[PDB]
Design a protein around this nucleic acid. Sequence first.
RNA 1: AUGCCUGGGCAGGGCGAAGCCAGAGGAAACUCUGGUGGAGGUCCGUAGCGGUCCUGACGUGCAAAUCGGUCGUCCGACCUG
RNA 2: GCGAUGGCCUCCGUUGCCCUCGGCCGAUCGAAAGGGAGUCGGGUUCAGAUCCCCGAAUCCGGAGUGGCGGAGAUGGGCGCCGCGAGGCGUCCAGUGCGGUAACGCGACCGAUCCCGGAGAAGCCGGCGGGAGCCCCGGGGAGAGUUCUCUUUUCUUUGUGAAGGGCAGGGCGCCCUGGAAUGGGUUCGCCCCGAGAGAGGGGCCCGUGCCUUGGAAAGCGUCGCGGUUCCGGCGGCGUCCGGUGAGCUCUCGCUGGCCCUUGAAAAUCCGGGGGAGAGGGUGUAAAUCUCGCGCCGGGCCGUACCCAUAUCCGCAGCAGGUCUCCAAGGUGAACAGCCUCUGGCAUGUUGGAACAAUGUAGGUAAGGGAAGUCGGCAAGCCGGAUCCGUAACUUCGGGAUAAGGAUUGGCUCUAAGGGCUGGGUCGGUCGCGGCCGGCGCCUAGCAGCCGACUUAGAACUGGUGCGGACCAGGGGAAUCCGACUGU
Lengths: 91, 114, 50, 99, 69
Amino acid sequence: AKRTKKVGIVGKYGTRYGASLRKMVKKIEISQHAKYTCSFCGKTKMKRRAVGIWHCGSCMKTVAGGAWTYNTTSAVTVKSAIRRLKELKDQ
Amino acid sequence: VQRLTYRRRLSYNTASNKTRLSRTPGNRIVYLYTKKVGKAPKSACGVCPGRLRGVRAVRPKVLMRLSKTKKHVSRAYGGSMCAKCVRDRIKRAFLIEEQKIVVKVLKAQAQSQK
Amino acid sequence: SSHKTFRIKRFLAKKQKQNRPIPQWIRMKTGNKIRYNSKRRHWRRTKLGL
Amino acid sequence: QVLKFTLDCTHPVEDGIMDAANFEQFLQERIKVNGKAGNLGGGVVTIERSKSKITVTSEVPFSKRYLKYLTKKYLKKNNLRDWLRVVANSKESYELRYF
Amino acid sequence: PRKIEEIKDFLLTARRKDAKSVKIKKNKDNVKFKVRCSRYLYTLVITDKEKAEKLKQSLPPGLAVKELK
RNA sequence: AUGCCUGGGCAGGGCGAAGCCAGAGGAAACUCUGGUGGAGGUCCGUAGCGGUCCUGACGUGCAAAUCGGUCGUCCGACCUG
RNA sequence: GCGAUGGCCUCCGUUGCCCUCGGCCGAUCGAAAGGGAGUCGGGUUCAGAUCCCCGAAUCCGGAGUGGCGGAGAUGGGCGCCGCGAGGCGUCCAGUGCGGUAACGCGACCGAUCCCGGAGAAGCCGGCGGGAGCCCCGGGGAGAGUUCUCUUUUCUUUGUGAAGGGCAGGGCGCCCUGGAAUGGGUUCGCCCCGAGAGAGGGGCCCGUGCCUUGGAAAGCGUCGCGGUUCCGGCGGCGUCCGGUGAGCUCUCGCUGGCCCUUGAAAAUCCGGGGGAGAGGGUGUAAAUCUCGCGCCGGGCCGUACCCAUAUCCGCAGCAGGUCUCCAAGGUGAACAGCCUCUGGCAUGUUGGAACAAUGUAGGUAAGGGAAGUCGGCAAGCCGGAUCCGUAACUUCGGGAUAAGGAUUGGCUCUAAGGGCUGGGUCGGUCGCGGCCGGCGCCUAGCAGCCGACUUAGAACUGGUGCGGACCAGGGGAAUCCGACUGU
Ligand SMILES: [Zn+2]
Ligand SMILES: [Zn+2]
């Protein structure tokens, strides 16, 4: 809040595009541009290369994830369900 | 100030029409058409961003004129793969072969027990 | 155009050679009804629309 | 370092156009060292006369074309820049020649 | 062109069958001998003057050793 | 007029978003101050693109639609071979 | 493997048959701006010259007999002779070598097959390196002014492609070592126990400096041979330094943006393998050929205009038509104005007067929109610095809101920086080098250089100072359309 009160990243859009639309965009704009922690090296190098594809600067590992987030809640849920079904089937 | 023109008929400034300034013994600045900057071969691993060392970065058709020693390095996978990934491949191959031998021994022991 | 093809250059050469005027001794023939070339082409007008 | 520059005028005075003594006096008056025209900047530059050849010897760095500029100014003052011209006959040397 | 550091190598180069006119240029302490061949013009730079004078007499076959001036 | 391929081009300035640094306050949450940063289908504005107004000039004209001043835009839904 | 001819039917080539092996992916066309190996310097014509002449190179293809040298290369053991160097007979190995490593050395066998790389990549911002140009302090050469001054102002003051070496950049390359008291570091970023700082190395570009080319040639000057033709002859110079958010080009790092991810193929190269070849102890098969030597590269365009006269508009039409090079001053600026190199005669005519109407510019006492449908037109404000800035709001804006002060000239002051230098004393060797305890500037001082700014002070001009040029008129509201765009 040093410079802007409640816009931050969406301050580049200025007065345009509507306050509610900018507020809705802000979450995605922060999430896609935020660098995550790579769970291969432990470094904060996971950067969104393109839509749904993330790249590690150090590991050079490319992971197919969400469009704006590294891991989506739907992906986590489906992974857990698939693991549970695999364990149930194999016993 | 001496203003200079193109010495060819390609007036458009394109990739093939790049020039540089050069001073002649006649004491007049002229244009010399420079060749494109070649890049050294990249590692076949596909993981290391850096390019291979010990090899000249020149055009592929100039690689034909270049001698054999300039186009590679004296090593296994020399001039085609980086030393780091080469040694990683060596140790990975050794460890996988040892693990396969161990698995085969365990399977034989299980067959003998059964 | 300085980048002409062989056929175009030959056509231009023939049209250049055809542009010369009539020899004077032509009019001295007995059955001569010709006074001037009447087919001369100047480069400025009648642009030879190739 | 010793800088010796000659301003030899072999035959503008033989014809009786200019005077070597007057030229030497003009040079001694007008030679400027470190922004000081008078006194030749102390005992630094010296002028020798040979009734045809004027020799300027200096110890501090000294421009050779300064002598040419002074000679041209003297000729203009004496109205001689019409049939006379200063030519670098050789290094460290100058000569007055006709057209 | 190629510069030669050895007088013996220069003599071997000049003794070639394809070798031709070998010119001598006195360059005021930078005297040089330039021998023309099929592919390269081989140059030899001699600092000494008496050494160059002696080498002037080392041409075997009576070549085109005519100097440059 | 539109879609595609392959090339070229777009002075100088204003606003100073994310991110980062230092100082101060706090018990914490964190908050203020001074800087760094140069994002924007951002603003003034040249080249370029287009043509609002004077319903100006001309209107058997320079021209079967041109010229002057004033104009909108000029990093992107841009201009163009 | 079989059959045949040809040529010293030795040896090789050729075609015919048989066995064997074999993915491609659609014939073909499609870019004189995409990819695409390899030529530069000087001279030269009335008109062409990276093409002609001279001088230096380079690429591709051929090279059977292979034209040469060099790499596979001339090792060890055993038994003898010989004082010795050395020589003979026999067993062999020998498709190279070095460095811990990154990798290097002029070569350094290799097929069908397979993998990979180059070709082959968006836009924008920042920084750094190099070059071209500009700037300054000087040396020279030629020169304008000199009624007064001006060590004067104006022009010039260099080296090609191709190789060798070295500066200078970059590395996500290696080795010793393991770090919190966290450290290193940029304009910003960023990096580190998945190995940071500190040392020693390695690789890529080296378009830059020295060198062959190459001073022979070119240029600036001074002087001659020649009635004339004459691409001549000669003396000298082509030098030493510092700079800058300076303009352009190029290279290299680093980032930001995409519900945009920013081309294919020809061609070339590297790597995994050993199917196969070699002579057998002085030779050979191979040289992704190491240094040379020989021959050839065929066909087409090459002039000029490329635009207020060589193109299209009925024309020498104020229209339209895609690019490269981009000097000095003022100035934020590739704005406008003035000037240098270069270009020209004012744009299908000239002379004489300056009537009325006009077209394009201006100026007007007092009022200031009372004219007119309507402030149409014109005018006002305009740059920069310092203060100040409301209603509303989507809190981002409005905003250069509105409204105030300064701006010239000259003379000073203060602030914002780089490089070098103390290892001085004694001993010793040839001012320079080595060793020992000292001073350890650890509050830094001394010398030398350099680009611009910011603020303040006084004095002064007829209150004039963004003095030409460039260059926002604002405020209160209503209706419509979110906006940008078309
Ligand atoms: Zn990782
Ligand atoms: Zn790798």
